[PDB]
């Protein structure tokens, strides 16, 4: 229903939020579809309690990655590797961490047993 | 007036239980990077191993 109350001249920003509730713990493919699109217009602390209800980490990330909570996307790629990291797509939110610490245990997801490109990884830090 | 006005769960099962579903199917959602994680995890470390390895042999 929601797939054209989004669309009416009167659109308001509860609509693409709770849109999200459904799209979490339920279809998944399409859920990453829709946030990519609709980030802006939304909430985000709630949704990853809608999120973590949905351990969606392809999309659970991206959504830390605007949300800007670095830390926490990057950390999405430690217990979830196949899920959401993407070569250096890992690469380029660390730099933008406050705490250090993440990197040296990162190596190890990386330099531990990611050799060749691990390297590549010690370059930008 | 006293009907609306008087006002302002009446069958928990397809009601409420039905959140066991959505709760089942991803428990076994659930599964799989972990597991997958280690068995893929272990054949390519090792496969690590012998770059290094063969990194030894053909340099000596």
């Given at each position: 229903m929601?797939?054209?109350a ?5 659109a ?9 509730i459904?799209?979490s713990?339920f279809?998944?493919?399409?859920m990453?579809?829709?946030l ?8 985000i602390p709630?949704?990853?309690?809608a999120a ?22 990057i950390?999405?790629?430690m217990?979830?590797p ?16 406050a705490?250090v610490?993440?990197?040296?245990r ?9 050799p ?8 930008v830090? | ?17 039905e959140?066991?579903?959505?709760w ?14 280690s068995?893929?995890?272990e054949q390519?470390w090792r496969?690590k ?10 340099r000596?």
């Open positions: 929601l797939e054209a989004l669309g009416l001249e009167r308001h920003m509860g609509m693409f939020t709770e849109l999200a459904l799209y713990k279809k998944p493919q399409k990453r579809e829709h990519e699109l609709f980030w802006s217009r939304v909430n709630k949704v990853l309690r973590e209800q949905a351990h969606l980490w392809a999309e659970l990330v991206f959504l830390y990655d605007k949300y800007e909570e670095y830390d926490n996307a950390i999405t790629m217990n979830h196949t899920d959401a990291w993407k070569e250096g797509q890992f690469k380029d939110i660390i730099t933008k961490v705490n610490e993440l990197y040296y990162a190596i190890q997801f990386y330099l531990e047993f990611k060749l490109l691990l390297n590549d990884l010690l370059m830090l | 007036x006293x009907x609306x006005x008087x006002x302002x769960q009446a069958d928990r099962l397809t009601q409420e239980p959140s066991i579903r959505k089942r199917e991803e428990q076994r959602k659930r599964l799989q990077e972990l597991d997958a994680a068995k893929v995890m390519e496969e191993a012998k770059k290094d390895l063969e990194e030894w042999n053909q000596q």
